[PDB]
Amino acid sequence: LVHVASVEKGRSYEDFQKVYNAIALKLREDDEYDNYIGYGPVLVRLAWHISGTWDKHDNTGGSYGGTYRFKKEFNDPSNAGLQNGFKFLEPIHKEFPWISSGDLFSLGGVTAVQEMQGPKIPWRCGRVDTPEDTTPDNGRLPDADKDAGYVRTFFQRLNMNDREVVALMGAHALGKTHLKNSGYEGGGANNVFTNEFYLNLLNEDWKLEKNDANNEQWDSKSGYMMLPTDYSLIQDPKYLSIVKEYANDQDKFFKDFSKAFEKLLENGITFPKDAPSPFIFKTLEEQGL
Numbered sequence: 001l002v003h004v005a006s007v008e009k010g011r012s013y014e015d016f017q018k019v020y021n022a023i024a025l026k027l028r029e030d031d032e033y034d035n036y037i038g039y040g041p042v043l044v045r046l047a048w049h050i051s052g053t054w055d056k057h058d059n060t061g062g063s064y065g066g067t068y069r070f071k072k073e074f075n076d077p078s079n080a081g082l083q084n085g086f087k088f089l090e091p092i093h094k095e096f097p098w099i100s101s102g103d104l105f106s107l108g109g110v111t112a113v114q115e116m117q118g119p120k121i122p123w124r125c126g127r128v129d130t131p132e133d134t135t136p137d138n139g140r141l142p143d144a145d146k147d148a149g150y151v152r153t154f155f156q157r158l159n160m161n162d163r164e165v166v167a168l169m170g171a172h173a174l175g176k177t178h179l180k181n182s183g184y185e186g187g188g189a190n191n192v193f194t195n196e197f198y199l200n201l202l203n204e205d206w207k208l209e210k211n212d213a214n215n216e217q218w219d220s221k222s223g224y225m226m227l228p229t230d231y232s233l234i235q236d237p238k239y240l241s242i243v244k245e246y247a248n249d250q251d252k253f254f255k256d257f258s259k260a261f262e263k264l265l266e267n268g269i270t271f272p273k274d275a276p277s278p279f280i281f282k283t284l285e286e287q288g289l
């Protein structure tokens with residue numbers, strides 16, 4: 001199954017920078033969402049969920065087709081809460097109806113990471129909306145109540161290795177869980193992209209507790225939390241080495257995250273030899289906007 005990237009007709013870097021800027025200005029404007037976290041973290045989660053349905057074995061799922069817009073995927077229990085990100089992006093899509101759904105959802109993630117002071121994430125256009133019957137079934141996204149072996153095996157389906165996995169999970173520096181979405185009680189939350197997830201793992205005094213949904217999670221007296229799958233990164237000796245690496249080298253984490261996140265967003269997509277090079281968007285701050 002082959003999905004060839006096809007650039008939205010006549011569009012170039014400047015067009016996509018305008019879309020980035022619109023997303024970024026709305027991120028700045030709608031600052032009260034989720035107890036003043038803003039929509040940054042949920043847009044990153046959205047980009048990950050629309051991409052994380054991919055299966056390397058048959059090239060089903062993935063970001064290309066924009067299939068999150070269809071009821072089956074929209075209503076996946078694993079996607080509970082992402083409706084907020086979708087609604088956030090609706091007026092952006094109305095202003096720029098020429099952008100494909102997959103391009104918009106993925107660009108939303110890139111914009112959010114960068115605007116939250118994360119690394120630059122090169123981004124490529126050309127995802128094309130596919131029909132409703134191409135929507136992957138529910139159940140392709142990972143469970144949080146599992147161990148390191150589960151995480152490792154799960155991510156093999158997305159063609160991600162140990163480093164890639166550990167880097168990607170660093171996104172859990174952003175935002176929080178919500179008991180009503182996922183059955184996990186949210187802890188201390190930030191909207192700035194840093195390597196603090198790894199520092200938290202290594203430095204806090206974690207206690208295994210049960211939350212009000214009767215699920216186990218790791219909580220600190222400082223008020224932080226970790227999912228069981230988060231904590232598995234320090235239970236497994238291979239993951240632990242990498243956690244320590246990123247806790248001790250901000251720049252290395254940023255570079256590795258950028259590569260892994262672009263890869264995640266591009267899984268399943270064949271880029272023609274004469275496709276445009278990846279775009280690196282300027283932040284609002286860099287533009288003086």
Ligand code: HEM
Nearest residue numbers: 041042044045048142143144168171175176177178181182
């Ligand atoms: C084993 C893999 C993963 C599991 C089990 C997992 C699980 C979860 C859960 C349960 C939540 C809470 C959702 C809610 O209650 O609203 C969450 C939130 C989040 N996830 Fe993950 N996740 C995983 C990997 C990732 C990856 C790879 C990324 C991106 C690179 C990511 C980005 C985020 C972000 C940014 C949030 C915060 C959303 C918000 O604040 O609304 N996650 N994750």
Ligand SMILES: N=C(N)c1ccncc1
Nearest residue numbers: 172175176177225226227
């Ligand atoms: N470990 C966390 N604090 C976390 C943050 C956001 N999403 C999931 C987990």
